Amino acid sequence: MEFKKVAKETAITLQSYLTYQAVRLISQQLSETNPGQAIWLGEFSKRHPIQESDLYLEAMMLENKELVLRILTVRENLAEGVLEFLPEMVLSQIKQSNGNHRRSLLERL
């Protein structure tokens, strides 16, 4: 098994996913504080796929510089906050799901 090469791919995916989580947390905050801006943010995201997170951030710089700053900031905090718990949490989630599917497959016999 090619653990490191798959890790590199997974890292690229996770970079975009954590940008998505940052945008999500900021939207939830704006929904209490400035709903018009949360709405604007929601519309921007349907025009620009967060999957292409570098392109997403560059596009936003043309329309809302302050929000880009906020996303980069939150995404950085999130990463630092979350990343070290991930190995255990992901492996645990997979073990649980494996148990679940095995029991369903046994019921399927």
Added chain:
Amino acid sequence: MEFKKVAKETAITLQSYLTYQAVRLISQQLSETNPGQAIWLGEFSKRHPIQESDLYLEAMMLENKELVLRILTVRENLAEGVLEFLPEMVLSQIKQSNGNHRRSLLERL
């Protein structure tokens, strides 16, 4: 902890993404040992989106129980090795990305 909801949502996402990576690897092994099953698998993945990994596995066990059991095992083994590299890779990539976006933002009026 902190970011519990985020960390959890991220874990479930990576669980699906690592299932994708498991199926991809298995598909490659099957192309050598049982090309007809490699083809069945490709067709199966076209019709069932791997992003919905639990539904994918639940559908497959109706048709091919052995392959489900193999995916469960591979995705766990893969996760063990992949998650060891992930934190530092993802942090350093976010760092590089920030650097690029920072320059982009600072260099314009």
